[PDB]
A and B are shown apart, each in its own frame.
Chain A
């Protein structure tokens, strides 16, 4: 009995997790048998919040619910239709809990792009046909905040293709005030950003394919422009015209092209805005105070703090999140230290010249995230324990005595759990811990003051008993040392793995900037089929360019994508070959996104190591991928700065060297991210070079190739490919 392709694809072994939503400092909403229940952590009791029958009034069309902080009204979301990675339109209707009836008067319009409640109370703000509206109460008629909205040209409250994807990780660009006085939001102008057109074939019944278009900026092209406003919603009236107020950007960033990259209310009358230059090695933070007398927002340069980078770019993917103290007088942030390691730093609102910040943590390891901030303490995920970059543990530093640094999750189950996450309550009195590997995931309820386990939310005992009689793979997380530096790797070893045998090897690569494909988390996936059922070892290596091990490693591939990380993969495979248990004749490399680009570049290096490989949705040329991401690591593609390196690092130029390998190129026709064009060009270059390869398009699939039937088909197609490449 082995974990089969069928098992992966049909989800027979289900890895359960525990989703809860904190609604107060002692209570969370959890879902059970489709009923929303309310559990109080302070006592032991559970009540019923919303019964499944109320969802069933809309049959099975409900995709989500969302409750008002005060608990009087619920947004039932139905008719979800996806757009991009985060974006979608949906219809909403407000269920009034007290009354137990749908609010049928002045209803939320259909095709609504983004709706969210205020942080307190029950005020609504929505985005519809690109304009922001706001309802003070559910029954009241809506108030139109902006009217500049146009399809694909002007976006208010919602994000552009590239802002969504690359800076915010969300369709939302509107943020409510802490007590609901103001509604901050960003506006993006897309006039002049060139369009990526592609064919959409749809159903059999559609006689003529439809051309889909998106304003999408590529390396060097005309980017979008941004404007940040704030509007007062307490003065919302049909009698008086609503005036939004425009906070303008810093002088430092307005000189050339720039991005808005963070929005963070600190208090009622203060909001922080980080902006970033288009080069991305310089970033400015602007703390902006509200002047009540003349209703303008002022951003002093005494209040402007600048983080920059000489070694590469700012942040993992952008400047880190500001966590401000209760009085707004100081704030905490993950910033890069003297030796390159990113740690927590304490700033002040005012910017004394000599001193940027005070580093409260330090060492050869990185703070992954700041999780909560009390007056007494700060909680944070870090990878310090046991010098394992791909490990995560909860820590708690006391604001007063930084000597008082306590690791809350390190030794609870040291064998089962080396990768934790956490979700703390409104004022942090309680928290849920989620161990995500290397054992079966375990979610448990704890009290903050002294870590005492109050409950066990989910221990995956069901999956455990299902997997007890299955021959699963092992997982070796360890390292090899090249040039006096440790570069970690993970290997999904087959069941009953013996060092006296020679197994085939598959390298699963991503290898992008700030990537980590070797860590302690637990995954049931294609690799586990490949190890258990096929006896393929699947290894992944985090060489240069990988994150969480100091900037010296991460910025090592700066201005030079397709070089040091590409050869580091090739080198790793050599290092594993030296370990002796790998057959040199059967070594493979596969990957998706950046991984696909890396696999294509490794296959074309002429190294002689790798025999075959599969690129899925790959990048071929860096001038095709979007500006915000591409330019973060390469600069512009112009002679003034780095055009040669865009030219040096294309898959196309290495087509001659594909004559030594077996290549399987795959791409979805309706990919809006890494457009099909990129694979269309790789194929054209291989054909011109007289190279036989294999290919598979996927009609109407995006970057995910996520559709249930297409998903089953890609992984079955690739499995058969590897089956032939390794002679079974």
Chain B
């Protein structure tokens, strides 16, 4: 199973960016995003269950990372909002079956 993540994007102060995981090759219908900053460890952003709109987020990633899925399109969308220097990071997608079974290739948001 593989998830062809969208190409890297450049963003500046105050703006909002959207990113696409593009899952394929497995029975899609849970998906999670982890933010990786350069030189530092991984940090969990949130979870979407693709069948419904059910979302659970981490403490104080309210506002940032609005996670929504529409199933028809073979993908999941993570809208990061009001980006600053701290928000610049590697942002992977993942599939959750028992733990993080497969990982997306990452977008280097700036």
Contacts and interface: CB of A to CB of B under 8 A. Distances in A.
Interface of A: 51, 53-54, 56-59, 100-102, 104
Interface in B39-58: 47, 49, 51-56
Contacts of A102: 54-56
Contacts of B54: 53-54, 57, 100-102
A205 to B, nearest CB: 20
A57 B53 CA distance: 12
B53 A54 contact: no
A56 B53 contact: no
14 contacts: A53-B30, A53-B54, A54-B54, A56-B49, A57-B47, A57-B49, A57-B54, A100-B53, A101-B53, A101-B54, A101-B55, A102-B54, A102-B55, A104-B62
Nearest to A93: B56
Interface residues of B, number: 11
A57 B56 contact: yes
B28 interface: no
Contacts of A100: 52-54
Nearest to A53: B49
Closest 6 CB pairs of A and B: A57-B56, A53-B49, A100-B52, A57-B47, A100-B54, A56-B30
Contacts of B55: 57, 101-102
B56 A53 contact: no
A9 to B, nearest CB: 25
Contacts of B56: 57-58, 102
A58 B49 CA distance: 11
A609 to B, nearest CB: 54
B83 to A, nearest CB: 23
B52 A57 contact: no
Nearest to B47: A57
Interface in B49-105: 49, 51-56, 62, 96
Contacts of B96: 56, 59
A58 B46 CA distance: 10
Interface of A is mostly: loop
B90 to A, nearest CB: 22
A101 B46 CA distance: 13
B57 to A, nearest CB: 8
A58 B32 CA distance: 11
A53 B62 CA distance: 21
A175 to B, nearest CB: 32
B31 to A, nearest CB: 11
Given A102-B54, A104-B62, 19 more contacts: A51-B51, A53-B30, A53-B49, A53-B51, A53-B54, A54-B49, A54-B54, A56-B30, A57-B30, A57-B47, A57-B49, A57-B54, A57-B55, A57-B56, A58-B56, A100-B54, A101-B53, A101-B54, A101-B55
B60 to A, nearest CB: 12
Contacts of A104: 62
Contacts of A51: 51
Nearest to A102: B56
Interface string B9-51: 0000000000000000000001000000000000000010101
A101 B55 CA distance: 7
A61 to B, nearest CB: 11
Nearest to A95: B54
A624 B30 CA distance: 53
A57 B30 CA distance: 8
Contacts of A54: 49, 54
A101 B62 CA distance: 14
A53 B27 CA distance: 14
A104 B55 CA distance: 11
A611 to B, nearest CB: 51
A670 B52 CA distance: 46
Contacts of B53: 100-101
A101 B54 CA distance: 5
A51 B49 CA distance: 11
Contacts of A59: 96
A56 B51 CA distance: 13
B100 to A, nearest CB: 11
Nearest to A76: B56
Contacts of A101: 53-55
B81 to A, nearest CB: 17
Most chain-B CB neighbours within 10 Å: which of A57, A59, A101?
A: A57
Contacts of B49: 53-54, 56-57
